From a paper:
In contrast to the [name]-WT structure, in which every residue could be mapped, [name]-tTR10 and [name]-[name] both had a highly disordered region, where the mapping of the residues was not feasible due to high mobility. Asn170 was found to be further dislocated in [name]-[name], resulting in a wider opening in the active site cavity. However, for the same reason, it is logical to assume that the active site in [name]-[name] is larger than that in [name]-tTR10. In contrast, the interaction between W1 and Glu166 was lost in [name]-[name]. In this case, Lys73 may act as an alternative general base.
[name] (NCBI reference sequence: YP_439646.1) is highly conserved in pathogenic Burkholderia species, including Burkholderia pseudomallei, Burkholderia mallei, and Burkholderia cenocepacia. In this study, we demonstrate the extensive perturbation-absorbing capacity of the omega loop against TR mutations of various sizes, some of which are large enough to include the entire omega loop.
Author numbering: 22 to 163, 193 to 258, 260 to 272, 274 to 311
The structure:
Amino acid sequence: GSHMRNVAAEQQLRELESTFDGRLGFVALDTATGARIAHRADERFPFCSTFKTMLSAAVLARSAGDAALLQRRIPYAKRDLVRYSPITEKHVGAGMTVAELCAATLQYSDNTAANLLIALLGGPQAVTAYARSIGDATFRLDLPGDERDTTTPAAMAASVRRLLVGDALGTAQRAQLNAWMLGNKTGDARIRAGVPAGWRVADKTGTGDYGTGNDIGVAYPPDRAPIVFVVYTTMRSRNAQARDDVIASAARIAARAFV
């Protein structure tokens, strides 16, 4: 890699953004060197389901010195279900364990699972507090540039790096967060589609209206240092679809520059 290849990649990201009516927010970090490829890195974007990574980390932190928390079952009822709950809807009544809820919200993006975990922590402000505790002053869990439920690509990249690769969590908790995110089921068309097939990817997607299409995580090449990938996209038209292809293309541009 080189600075000039990174400069080239950043122009390619700008040219990629021109292909849709919106904004591309991107950070890729080669942890071998701290080399960063960035686009609109300091702008706020709606995070959508990508916050579930920060959620799950906060839950893992509560479990330090209390591993049995992960086996604790949380009951809930039908009235507790919110839209898009493909796992939790099958377990109304007795409910699911804390670990099951983390896996459901990370791997299937289950919304009720996220709400139950947010409640366990004491509310959305507890998730924001956790973010502050690992050095993230930007993340906020609470539309024409409403800052609620937003972060920046730079801030989320730093948090993803610290959580999955660095020391924000204890070693065992880092391992568990990675294991869950390596098993993601919702990201096949996003970062995973753009990086080499030989790289293991731990990722969390986010999708919303205004063509909001996000994917964050870490790629683990087989004989190199990990590369952090954060991709946020959002558009001017509320009706617009998220663009899996753009997310994949952004990751590809960075992967090409770093090899």
